[PDB]
Enzyme design. Structure first.
Site, PDB file in Angstrom:
ATOM      1  N   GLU A 152      51.356  43.250  36.666  1.00  0.00           N
ATOM      2  CA  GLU A 152      52.858  43.524  36.587  1.00  0.00           C
ATOM      3  C   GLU A 152      53.385  44.334  35.524  1.00  0.00           C
ATOM      4  O   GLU A 152      52.591  44.286  34.214  1.00  0.00           O
ATOM      5  CB  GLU A 152      53.608  42.156  36.603  1.00  0.00           C
ATOM      6  CG  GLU A 152      54.936  42.294  36.639  1.00  0.00           C
ATOM      7  CD  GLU A 152      55.615  43.252  37.826  1.00  0.00           C
ATOM      8  OE1 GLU A 152      55.963  42.636  38.945  1.00  0.00           O
ATOM      9  OE2 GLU A 152      55.730  44.465  37.724  1.00  0.00           O
TER      10      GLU A 152
ATOM     11  N   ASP B  24      50.549  40.137  40.395  1.00  0.00           N
ATOM     12  CA  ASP B  24      51.011  40.204  39.076  1.00  0.00           C
ATOM     13  C   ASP B  24      49.941  39.745  37.963  1.00  0.00           C
ATOM     14  O   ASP B  24      50.118  40.705  36.885  1.00  0.00           O
ATOM     15  CB  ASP B  24      52.035  38.897  38.780  1.00  0.00           C
ATOM     16  CG  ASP B  24      53.294  39.285  39.727  1.00  0.00           C
ATOM     17  OD1 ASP B  24      53.905  40.258  39.854  1.00  0.00           O
ATOM     18  OD2 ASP B  24      53.625  38.096  40.322  1.00  0.00           O
TER      19      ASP B  24
ATOM     20  N   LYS C 153      56.348  34.039  50.455  1.00  0.00           N
ATOM     21  CA  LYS C 153      55.140  34.532  49.810  1.00  0.00           C
ATOM     22  C   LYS C 153      53.830  34.408  50.426  1.00  0.00           C
ATOM     23  O   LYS C 153      53.094  35.395  50.602  1.00  0.00           O
ATOM     24  CB  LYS C 153      55.168  34.325  48.486  1.00  0.00           C
ATOM     25  CG  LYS C 153      56.280  35.059  47.368  1.00  0.00           C
ATOM     26  CD  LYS C 153      55.680  36.022  46.554  1.00  0.00           C
ATOM     27  CE  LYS C 153      56.630  36.767  46.089  1.00  0.00           C
ATOM     28  NZ  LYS C 153      57.566  36.144  44.711  1.00  0.00           N
TER      29      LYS C 153
HETATM   30  C1  LIG Z   1      57.338  46.394  43.142  1.00  0.00           C
HETATM   31  C2  LIG Z   1      56.370  45.343  43.076  1.00  0.00           C
HETATM   32  N1  LIG Z   1      56.967  44.086  43.338  1.00  0.00           N
HETATM   33  C3  LIG Z   1      58.541  43.945  44.341  1.00  0.00           C
HETATM   34  N2  LIG Z   1      59.546  43.011  44.105  1.00  0.00           N
HETATM   35  C4  LIG Z   1      59.922  43.491  42.613  1.00  0.00           C
HETATM   36  C5  LIG Z   1      60.793  45.014  42.577  1.00  0.00           C
HETATM   37  C6  LIG Z   1      60.681  45.725  41.596  1.00  0.00           C
HETATM   38  C7  LIG Z   1      61.504  47.005  41.603  1.00  0.00           C
HETATM   39  C8  LIG Z   1      62.374  47.487  42.532  1.00  0.00           C
HETATM   40  C9  LIG Z   1      62.636  46.456  43.726  1.00  0.00           C
HETATM   41  C10 LIG Z   1      61.760  45.225  43.549  1.00  0.00           C
HETATM   42  C11 LIG Z   1      62.033  44.148  44.806  1.00  0.00           C
HETATM   43  S1  LIG Z   1      62.815  42.758  43.996  1.00  0.00           S
HETATM   44  C12 LIG Z   1      61.916  42.102  42.619  1.00  0.00           C
HETATM   45  C13 LIG Z   1      62.728  41.112  42.095  1.00  0.00           C
HETATM   46  C14 LIG Z   1      62.226  40.233  40.685  1.00  0.00           C
HETATM   47  C15 LIG Z   1      61.094  40.615  40.251  1.00  0.00           C
HETATM   48  C16 LIG Z   1      60.361  41.762  40.907  1.00  0.00           C
HETATM   49  C17 LIG Z   1      60.815  42.426  41.852  1.00  0.00           C
HETATM   50  N3  LIG Z   1      58.798  41.918  43.541  1.00  0.00           N
HETATM   51  C18 LIG Z   1      59.312  40.452  43.994  1.00  0.00           C
HETATM   52  C19 LIG Z   1      58.916  39.184  43.521  1.00  0.00           C
HETATM   53  C20 LIG Z   1      57.778  39.089  42.961  1.00  0.00           C
HETATM   54  O1  LIG Z   1      57.209  38.019  42.661  1.00  0.00           O
HETATM   55  C21 LIG Z   1      56.863  40.500  42.734  1.00  0.00           C
HETATM   56  O2  LIG Z   1      55.754  40.468  41.888  1.00  0.00           O
HETATM   57  C22 LIG Z   1      57.564  41.847  43.095  1.00  0.00           C
HETATM   58  C23 LIG Z   1      56.858  43.155  42.733  1.00  0.00           C
HETATM   59  O3  LIG Z   1      55.784  43.103  42.201  1.00  0.00           O
HETATM   60  C24 LIG Z   1      55.376  45.514  44.334  1.00  0.00           C
HETATM   61  F1  LIG Z   1      54.582  44.188  44.573  1.00  0.00           F
HETATM   62  F2  LIG Z   1      56.160  45.827  45.534  1.00  0.00           F
HETATM   63  F3  LIG Z   1      54.477  46.550  43.986  1.00  0.00           F
HETATM   64 MN   LIG Z   2      55.555  38.124  41.490  1.00  0.00          MN
HETATM   65 MN   LIG Z   3      54.634  41.923  40.735  1.00  0.00          MN
END
Ligand SMILES: C[C@@H](N1CN([C@H]2c3ccccc3CSc3ccccc32)n2ccc(=O)c(O)c2C1=O)C(F)(F)F
Ligand SMILES: [Mn+2]
Ligand SMILES: [Mn+2]
Length: 179
Positions: free
Chosen positions: A64, A92, A118
């Site tokens: 991450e 992550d 998840k």
């Molecule tokens: C991009 C990466 N994302 C998506 N998404 C992310 C994210 C990032 C940018 C724009 C939109 C969003 C969706 S909203 C959100 C809300 C809180 C934290 C992270 C996030 N996740 C949600 C929960 C997680 O636990 C997590 O790891 C991710 C994550 O890593 C991916 F896996 F898709 F490549």
């Molecule tokens: Mn995550």
């Molecule tokens: Mn992530």
């Protein structure tokens, strides 16, 4: 120009704010508009960083907080060196001690619902899931919580501090009624 945006910038560390801002924009979301998502990515990032500081020196690789291409690059290197299967979706962390990827979750709902989603979406059973909530519950795959109690406790303390700081500014209700 929202109150939530100014709160995030004074609540979180500047390196964390900038990495989250660059994550949102990479995937098309505007942090000045999607301000609850701004608060959530900052929170998730801080938890990921606190988590990777929870073990011994070289225990975790942090996936991450990178751009899409470099995160997948480090995953491919971990896989083609560990023998661990390549996740369908970006995790992550990687745990060099337990030899597994970790998906960290932060939710404003009951941790059980978020873990189900998840889990269901993870497809890769391989990846270990660790959910934290803003109320102090946690929940991890196979009841295996990776870190010891004190490093998990400080993460839960910080989550509850963020919630109180929001609540003192009347931003918690909008934040909780938006997940
Ligand atoms: C991009 C990466 N994302 C998506 N998404 C992310 C994210 C990032 C940018 C724009 C939109 C969003 C969706 S909203 C959100 C809300 C809180 C934290 C992270 C996030 N996740 C949600 C929960 C997680 O636990 C997590 O790891 C991710 C994550 O890593 C991916 F896996 F898709 F490549
Ligand atoms: Mn995550
Ligand atoms: Mn992530």
């Amino acid at each position: 120009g929202s109150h939530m945006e100014d709160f995030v910038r004074q609540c979180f560390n500047p390196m964390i704010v900038e990495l989250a801002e660059k994550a949102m924009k990479e995937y098309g979301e505007d942090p000045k508009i999607e301000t609850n998502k701004f608060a959530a990515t900052c929170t998730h990032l801080e938890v990921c960083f606190m988590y990777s500081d929870g073990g011994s020196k070289h225990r975790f690789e942090i996936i991450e907080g990178r751009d899409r291409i470099m995160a997948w690059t480090v995953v491919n290197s971990i896989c083609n060196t560990t023998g661990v299967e390549k996740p369908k979706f970006l995790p992550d962390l990687y745990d060099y001690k337990e030899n597994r990827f970790i998906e960290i979750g932060v939710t404003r709902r009951e941790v059980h619902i978020y873990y189900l989603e998840k889990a269901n979406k993870i497809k890769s059973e391989k990846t270990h899931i660790h959910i934290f909530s803003f109320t102090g519950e946690e929940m991890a795959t196979k009841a295996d919580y990776t870190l010891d109690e004190e490093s998990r406790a400080r993460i839960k303390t910080r989550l509850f501090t963020i919630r109180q700081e929001m609540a003192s500014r009347s931003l918690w209700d909008s934040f909780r009624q938006s997940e």
